[PDB]
Design a protein around this ligand. Structure first.
Ligand SMILES: CCCCCCCCCCCCCCCCCC(=O)OC[C@H](COP(=O)(O)OCCN)OC(=O)CCCCCCCCCCCCCCCCC
Ligand SMILES: CCCCCCCCCCCCCCCCCC(=O)OC[C@H](COP(=O)(O)OCCN)OC(=O)CCCCCCCCCCCCCCCCC
Ligand SMILES: CCCCCCCCCCCCCCCCCC(=O)OC[C@H](COP(=O)(O)OCCN)OC(=O)CCCCCCCCCCCCCCCCC
Ligand SMILES: CCCCCCCCCCCCCCCCCC(=O)OC[C@H](COP(=O)(O)OCCN)OC(=O)CCCCCCCCCCCCCCCCC
Ligand SMILES: CCCCCCCCCCCCCCCCCC(=O)OC[C@H](COP(=O)(O)OCCN)OC(=O)CCCCCCCCCCCCCCCCC
Ligand SMILES: CCCCCCCCCCCCCCCCCC(=O)OC[C@H](COP(=O)(O)OCCN)OC(=O)CCCCCCCCCCCCCCCCC
Lengths: 98, 347, 115, 140, 175, 51, 80, 120, 105, 48, 171
């Protein structure tokens, strides 16, 4: 295939390794999640526009809609976490270890 | 919680599950997964304690990452196929990513870490809804794509989750963590047979759902969440101790009880294809599961642990709980073995 | 091609004025000129402290309503269809669902600020 | 991890001890790397040096297990002149278990590992002889 | 060189992705994702879908500004590691940039690379089409047909968004 | 089975509700000082705000 | 219900105006007869190419020339 | 297995062809066993609510038995239909493919040879 | 549990989107509509096993229409050989590939 | 160009059919200069 | 696979209608009304056999017909047509509605000189029928032979032989 596909999936893999290795900040992992959804959007619309699948042009709008819905859910859960503890550090979520 | 809002949220969860179950499109499958997850998040936050926030955050992160892998597999299949139909995948990379996404959604080892913590941090009813309802859409999608799953990957996941769940169930004194590790072992049991005969997987799904629903309803009715709290039931209602005794005996695959029927048919199906070492290993780890079930039933039924003084005050009041379908579900979870050829209706 | 030429022309017009605003005049820089300005007195703590926000719910629903209006923008092209009744019904139903969400937030005191 | 097993199994047994020793040491090294990586991921070491020391200790232990297992099995099949026999692999498994006991510095772990790894190595030779399938492809 | 315009835009795309996937600070992560969204809009605009690029740019800019407000409220500290202030962040940023430039040099020399798929060396102008689209734009007409064909999609999306508002309002309740 | 790692692991509470562990909320302390058009010439309002 | 309408117009007239406008927009395409003309105008817009059919012999309805009498004409679009 | 069989005719609990089969008797041992399961469930429903087990709520136990018998009757009809369609498909495939299923000619015991292993 | 409700009820919810050769707004054809039509009609009602055995030619040709691996492979071969010939000095490009030839229409 | 390369056949179609296919963008302007490349491929999108 | 086929450059040579797009747009309706038969024959064949290598002589014929129509236009009303296409060509979007006076002048001159009536609204979008002599292509898609379908299940449903036949269950 084309090398633009190489760079798009390579960006997806970068943001996947970013999400799966935490840096003691939940919001940065949320940003990595939005980066992964952006990469999925770009890849999908690239192939859809190249292969002239015209009816599938409505799809990435729906995908980005659900991306933002789950982002809003993540932000609300982060408000609850930051209202319990002092900060948003991911090491404070260790009560369920005993 | 407003009961109208709770009813709306529960119907939306069910709607997401059937949207996954009835659609012929990968994007609609993904939409159903997203709406199910985002509608079951607030059920786990019903009591508003920090443990519910921890459980909801960990569950949200795991299901989000699994959904991303699901979408990547879908997009790669679109690339190499040019279509969207829910059938086998036309790429091994997409098949492997879809299998790991559905394993992360099912809580299969080595993606099993979130399940005991999420199960512990949420109330008993939300845990029941999780462990029964949420474990149908990934099983349905796995039923759809069985021509394309790599046998080595799915068998590795199945035996790994069986061994890890059976080993981890030996070190728990809370009931919800015990139930989560038992759930991990049972998903290993079902998916070890999926590539051979998926009707066996459907039968195992139904029996496991019935059995764990009966046990969760028993724990809700007695209002016990730890084993030392479960040990007071002989001073409260001995019939409930008899019920938990027979259901724990059935849950270990002990004949002539109905819980032995799934494992028996799994061993029957997997030896038609000359695989003998694997069902023996699964049988021995099922013995480990039966061990921690035996420990629980020694705690609650076959001995009389010391009770307290206020148990008299609890004697004076009869229960008014809404034990919905408990006797029917107990009977189905215990004595369904002479009706074994009923399984052909799932063909 | 012309758009990148225009953007580059605007950018090197903007960065030319800043670069001649940093090297031209005479500088007298001390360890009092660049202190933070707190109306004449020394600040009591850092400026990187958590500045708590009361309108979090309105921001989350701003995300959701921004996506609702993102779904709504194909309407001038969608009015050029043949299945006009179904398009009209789905447009009306989407806008009605937006209004239902807004009204449910209004009746539940979600738009009111905390504290 | 598939081509390493195929690199080990294609040599006839009891023929060249050095190539079989190298192949089995490669299997042991791969096992040690994956075990050590899971260990440092799931259990955080105290510092960098402790992590690399633990990783190196694990892979050296498993590499020793593989090396002396392959050497012992090939030497036994060479001396006995009976290559397609699980007895050679039984002695190889017990020698590996003794090596694990020496690495852990305990005799009980050594004896238990001798017994169990000898049984598993003999069973592996039996499965290679009779074509037993663990991940058997579907037939019916 | 100008034939490789989408290649240069995708290299800026990956540069922003590895800039913000190092997780230095969510302000600078926001800047990096803004850069990535803008250049992704550029990429999909040379592929023809200007509407989709404008929507993804607008949506991500709104989301990034709201989350900037959030980290100025919630995710902030005394001395934010903006960049170069931490060892692991600078190390992983340099590692990602070096890996990306390494594979760009590799694909601009052999004109073919094999990472798990197989990627070609030329620009992506070759995979275009030589025909005309007439008097309409394909992407605009597809998202217009969302209303006349996708009634089920509209129903499930609107219901999911309404219950999403309900979900986020009954999450941040406190009791 | 208690071990060295499982030594500080307390059981969860009976109601599964923890005490709120109220850390200091760190109200921002602004200085509406004299060099301000709002303050009538000279007025040093030390002002503790929650945002 | 008249007292409630008077109260809500006295308190928040913007919501009353919005509800009236939305109700008007909902109920007017049901009762109006000009919508079919819009449907036919949208149908009669030639985006594609009108490819011709092979004359087997039994098709007297389809014309042979653009100026033939038979076929769908657009006189109503001129008059309206 | 039979997914492609129930692929062109979906979501039918019991097709038209199921009526060609004999229905189960009302004195089926399986149906009587399902009714007995319903009776046990009625006893447990009485027992867990601290009611007298054999006397309280006879209408409830009757409804339990009746509902169990009804649902079990339909489930048994489906099970018998599925076994019938399995056998019909198997025999049609055996008839259609005479090459892959040869007719084995059995030999009497005067022609065969079996090794004798003495016990002593 | 693929509880197919759409064929039982007679409604369609996502059937119009699932393939590239379905009905499009004013009949806009895709790039590989014909290849998808050929592969779909080759492998209808024969099952997946017979689909991958008896329609391999049609499916691989359709897949080459989709991603175009071999087309750019041949173009890469031609481009590389032309560059090596230009650098070595055994080839000169024709005038109609240089920038002007009084183009056809 | 292809005279020295062994195993080469000119005019080879990479598809298994004899059906006429739409000419790819690189199959038409593959040998022409970059001005025509920018004018044909990105020409309409870049045009003002 | 197969070596792709392509006609020689002598088969593609033709005299070209060398005019700007404003000349085509100005006289579009007269060209559509007068030259409908070779244009529609070419369109029918081009849509039918889906091949430009087999649709070359009809393109040649349509070029000759368009050139003949323009050569007829040049003989009689060259100056009103020149003014009309100039007034069309000044506009940026080539609007029809900015040159109704030249429309009337060109229409009157053409109608009085040759007798050509412009099509009405909605007439050039009509779908017509074309009578031609080419055979219908039996296989335009070059489809191979379709695979044999699976045999259909037939016969009455007998009861199951000896019941379930599952382990020890007699029914
Ligand atoms: C104390 C606890 C309670 C009691 C526990 C149970 C005790 C009794 C059960 C185990 C008894 C020993 C196993 C059976 C012995 C007879 C068969 C056998 O395994 O022979 C060993 C075999 C003999 O040599 P050969 O002539 O090749 O064997 C013919 C069969 N293949 O030898 C060889 O070929 C060489 C060695 C091969 C590996 C032998 C060990 C693995 C297999 C047996 C286990
Ligand atoms: C041999 C040897 O040294 O055994 C001692 C060892 C325990 O040694 P340790 O206590 O660690 O010093 O002991 C061990 O490692 C375990 C015992 C050695 C193996 C014993 C096998 C026979 C056991 C009884 C079988 C009866 C039938
Ligand atoms: C108690 C536990 C008992 C376990 C008994 C396992 C018996 C052996 C089964 C696996 C095995 O070794 O199979 C042999 C096989 C090589 O045999 P062959 O078929 O000749 O080679 C072609 C490869 N398909 O080998 C292979 O295919 C590769 C090697 C597989 C080794 C599996 C066991 C590794 C050690 C334990 C973990
Ligand atoms: C192969 C898999 C690994 C690929 C990347 C390898 C280089 C980067 C990692 C170097 C090793 C350090 C490490 O993993 O740090 C984890 C770090 C969070 O660590 P922290 O808790 O801040 O500090 C403890 C460490 N002293 O967390 C992070 O560094 C997370 C951010 C990683 C971003 C990766 C982007 C670069 C591209 C990777 C390949 C795609
Ligand atoms: C069917 C028509 C189409 C319907 C769908 C499309 C709707 C488009 C408009 C969307 C409006 C979204 C927001 C609605 C919020 C309603 C609830 C609310 O907030 O009411 C508050 C208001 C009284 O104000 P207060 O209590 O002070 O509010 C707190 C601070 N302002 O309470 C009020 O003022 C009373 C609100 C309820 C009564 C409104 C009556 C309007 C009647 C108009 C004439 C009849 C129109 C025909 C349809 C029947 C409508 C009921
Ligand atoms: C109690 C059962 C009540 C069943 C009510 C009717 C439901 C229905 O119509 O189910 C249809 C289904 C057969 O559907 P089918 O097209 O065969 O697809 C199988 C996909 N796995 O039929 C079935 O799946 C029948 C078996 C359902 C068993 C559910 C309880 C155990």
């Amino acid at each position: 295939m084309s090398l633009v596909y190489m760079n798009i999936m390579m960006a997806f893999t970068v943001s996947l390794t970013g999400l799966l290795m935490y840096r003691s900040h939940l919001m940065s992992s949320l940003l990595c999640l939005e980066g992964m959804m952006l990469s999925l959007f770009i890849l999908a619309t690239l192939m859809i526009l190249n292969s002239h699948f015209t009816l599938a042009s409505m799809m990435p709008i729906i995908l980005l809609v659900f991306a933002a819905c789950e982002a809003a859910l993540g932000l609300s859960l982060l408000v609850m976490v930051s209202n319990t503890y002092g900060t948003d550090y991911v090491q404070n979520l260790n009560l369920l270890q005993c | 919680m407003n009961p109208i809002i709770l009813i709306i949220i529960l119907m939306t969860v069910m709607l997401g599950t059937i949207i996954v179950m009835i659609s012929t499109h990968w994007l609609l499958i993904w939409i159903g997964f997203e709406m199910n997850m985002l509608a079951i998040i607030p059920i786990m936050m019903k009591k508003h304690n920090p443990r519910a926030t921890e459980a909801s955050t960990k569950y949200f992160l795991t299901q989000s990452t699994a959904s991303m892998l699901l979408m990547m597999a879908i997009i790669i299949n679109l690339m190499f196929s040019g279509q969207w139909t829910v059938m086998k995948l036309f790429n091994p990379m997409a098949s492997m990513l879809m299998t790991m996404a559905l394993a992360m959604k099912l809580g299969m080892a080595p993606f099993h870490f979130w399940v005991p913590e999420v199960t512990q941090g949420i109330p008993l009813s939300s845990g029941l809804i999780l462990l029964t309802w949420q474990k149908l859409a990934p099983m349905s999608v796995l039923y759809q794509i069985l021509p394309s799953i790599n046998l080595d990957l799915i068998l590795t996941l199945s035996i790994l989750s069986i061994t890890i769940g059976g080993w981890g169930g030996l070190n728990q004194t809370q009931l919800r963590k015990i139930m989560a590790y038992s759930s991990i072992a049972h998903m290993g049991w079902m998916t070890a047979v999926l590539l051979y005969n998926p009707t066996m997987t459907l039968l195992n799904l139904i029996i496991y759902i019935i059995m764990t629903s009966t046990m969760f309803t028993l724990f809700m009715a007695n209002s016990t969440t730890t084993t030392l709290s479960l040990s007071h039931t002989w001073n409260k209602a001995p019939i409930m101790t008899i019920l938990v005794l027979i259901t724990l005996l059935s849950m270990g695959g002990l004949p002539p009880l109905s819980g032995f029927m799934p494992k028996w048919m799994i061993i029957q199906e997997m030896t038609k294809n000359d695989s003998i070492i694997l069902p023996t290993l699964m049988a021995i780890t099922a013995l480990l599961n039966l061990y921690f079930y035996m420990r629980l039933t020694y705690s609650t039924a076959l001995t009389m642990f010391p009770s307290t003084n206020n148990m008299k005050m609890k004697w004076q009041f009869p229960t008014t709980k809404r034990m919905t379908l408990l006797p029917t579900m107990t009977v189905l979870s215990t004595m369904l073995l002479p009706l074994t050829p009923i399984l052909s209706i799932l063909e | 091609m012309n758009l990148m030429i225009t953007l580059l022309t605007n950018f090197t017009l903007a960065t030319l004025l800043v670069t001649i605003a940093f090297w031209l005049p005479q500088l007298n820089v001390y360890s009092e000129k660049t202190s933070p300005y707190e109306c004449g007195f020394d600040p009591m703590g850092s400026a990187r402290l958590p500045f708590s926000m009361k309108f979090f719910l309105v921001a989350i629903t701003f995300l959701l309503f921004d996506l609702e209006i993102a779904l709504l923008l194909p309407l001038p092209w969608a009015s050029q269809t043949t299945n006009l009744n179904t398009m009209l019904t789905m447009a009306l139903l989407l806008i009605f669902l937006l209004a239902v969400s807004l009204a449910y937030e209004w009746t539940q005191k979600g738009l009111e600020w905390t504290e | 991890a598939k081509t390493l097993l195929h690199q080990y199994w294609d040599i006839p047994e009891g023929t060249e001890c050095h190539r079989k020793t190298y192949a089995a040491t490669s299997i042991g090294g791969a096992s040690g790397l994956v075990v050590s990586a899971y260990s440092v991921a799931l259990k955080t070491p105290t510092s960098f040096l402790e992590g690399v020391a633990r990783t190196g200790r694990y892979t050296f232990t498993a590499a020793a297990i593989g090396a002396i297992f392959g050497l012992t099995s090939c030497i036994s099949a060479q001396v006995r002149e009976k290559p397609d026999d699980p007895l050679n692999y039984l002695i190889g498994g017990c020698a590996g278990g003794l090596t694990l006991g020496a690495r852990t510095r305990s005799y009980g772990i050594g004896a238990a590992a001798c017994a169990y790894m000898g049984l598993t190595a003999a069973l592996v030779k039996m499965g290679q002889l009779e074509g037993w399938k663990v991940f058997a492809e579907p037939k019916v | 060189m100008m034939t490789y315009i989408v290649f240069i835009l995708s290299i800026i795309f990956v540069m922003g992705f590895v800039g913000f996937s190092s997780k230095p600070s969510p302000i600078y992560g926001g800047l990096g994702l803004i850069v990535s969204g803008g250049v992704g809009c550029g990429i999909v605009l040379n592929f023809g879908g200007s509407f989709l690029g404008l929507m993804v740019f607008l949506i991500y800019l709104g989301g990034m500004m709201v989350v900037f407000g959030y980290t100025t409220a919630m995710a902030t500290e005394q001395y934010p590691e903006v960049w170069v202030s931490n060892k692991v962040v600078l190390g992983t940023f340099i590692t990602g940039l070096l890996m990306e430039f390494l594979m760009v040099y590799y694909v601009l020399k052999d004109k073919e690379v094999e990472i798990v798929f197989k990627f070609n060396g030329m620009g992506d102008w070759v995979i275009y089409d030589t025909g005309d689209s007439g008097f309409f734009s394909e992407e605009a007409m597809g998202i217009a047909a969302l209303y006349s064909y996708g009634t089920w999609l509209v129903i499930v999306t609107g219901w999911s968004l309404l219950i999403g508002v309900v979900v986020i309002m009954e999450i941040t309740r406190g009791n | 089975y208690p071990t060295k790692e499982t030594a500080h692991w307390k059981p969860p509470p009976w109601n599964d509700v923890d005490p709120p562990k109220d850390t200091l909320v760190s109200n921002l302390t602004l200085n509406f000082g004299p060099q301000h058009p709002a303050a009538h010439g000279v007025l040093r309002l030390v002002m503790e705000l929650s945002g | 219900v008249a007292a409630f309408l008077k109260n809500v117009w006295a308190k928040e007239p913007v919501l009353v105006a919005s509800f009236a406008i939305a109700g008007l927009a909902v109920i007017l395409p049901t009762l109006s007869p000009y919508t079919k003309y819009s449907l036919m105008i949208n149908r009669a817009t030639p985006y594609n190419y009108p490819v011709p059919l092979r004359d087997d012999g039994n098709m007297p309805d389809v014309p042979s020339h653009p100026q033939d009498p038979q076929g769908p004409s657009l006189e109503w679009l001129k008059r309206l | 297995m039979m997914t492609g069989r129930q692929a062109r005719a979906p979501l039918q609990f019991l097709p038209d062809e199921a009526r060609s089969l004999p229905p189960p008797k009302l004195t089926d041992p399986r149906l009587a066993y399902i009714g007995f399961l319903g009776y046990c469930s009625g006893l447990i429903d009485n027992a867990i609510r601290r009611r007298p087990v054999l006397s309280a709520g006879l209408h409830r136990q009757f409804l339990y038995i009746t509902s169990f018998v009804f649902v079990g009757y339909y489930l048994l009809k489906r099970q018998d239909y599925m076994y019938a369609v399995r056998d019909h498909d198997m025999f049609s495939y055996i008839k259609s493919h005479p090459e892959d299923f040869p007719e084995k000619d059995k030999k009497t015991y005067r022609e065969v040879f079996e090794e004798f292993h003495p016990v002593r | 549990p693929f509880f197919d409700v759409q064929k039982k009820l007679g409604v369609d919810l996502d059937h119009w989107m699932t393939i590239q050769s379905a009905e499009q707004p004013h009949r806009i054809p895709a790039r590989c509509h014909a290849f998808e039509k050929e592969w779909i009609e080759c492998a209808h009602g024969i099952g997946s096993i017979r689909a991958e055995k008896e329609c391999k030619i049609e499916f691989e040709d359709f897949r080459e229409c989709l991603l175009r691996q071999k087309t750019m492979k041949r173009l890469n071969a031609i481009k590389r050989q032309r560059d090596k010939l230009i650098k070595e000095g055994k080839y000169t490009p024709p005038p109609h590939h240089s920038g002007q030839e009084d183009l056809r229409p | 160009i292809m005279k020295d390369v062994p195993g080469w056949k000119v005019g080879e179609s990479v598809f298994h059919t004899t059906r006429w296919v739409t000419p790819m963008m690189g199959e038409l302007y593959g040998l022409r200069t970059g001005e025509e490349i920018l004018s044909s491929t990105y020409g309409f999108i870049w045009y003002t | 696979p197969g070596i792709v086929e392509l006609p020689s450059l002598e088969d593609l040579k033709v005299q070209e209608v060398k005019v700007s797009s404003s000349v085509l747009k100005a006289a579009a309706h007269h060209y559509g009304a007068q030259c409908d038969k070779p244009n529609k024959e070419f369109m029918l064949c081009r849509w039918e056999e889906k091949d430009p290598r087999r649709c070359l002589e009809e393109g040649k014929l349509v070029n000759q017909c368009a050139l003949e129509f323009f050569r007829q236009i040049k003989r009689h009303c060259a100056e009103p047509f020149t003014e009309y296409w100039t007034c069309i060509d000044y506009s940026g979007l080539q609007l029809f509605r900015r040159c109704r006076k030249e429309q009337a002048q060109f229409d009157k001159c053409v109608l009085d000189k040759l007798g050509w009536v412009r099509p009405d609204l909605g007439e050039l979008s009509k779908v017509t029928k074309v009578k031609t002599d080419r055979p219908l292509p039996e296989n335009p898609y070059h489809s191979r032979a379709r695979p044999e379908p699976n045999p259909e299940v037939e016969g009455d449903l007998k009861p199951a032989r000896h019941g379930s036949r599952l382990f020890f269950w007699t029914m």
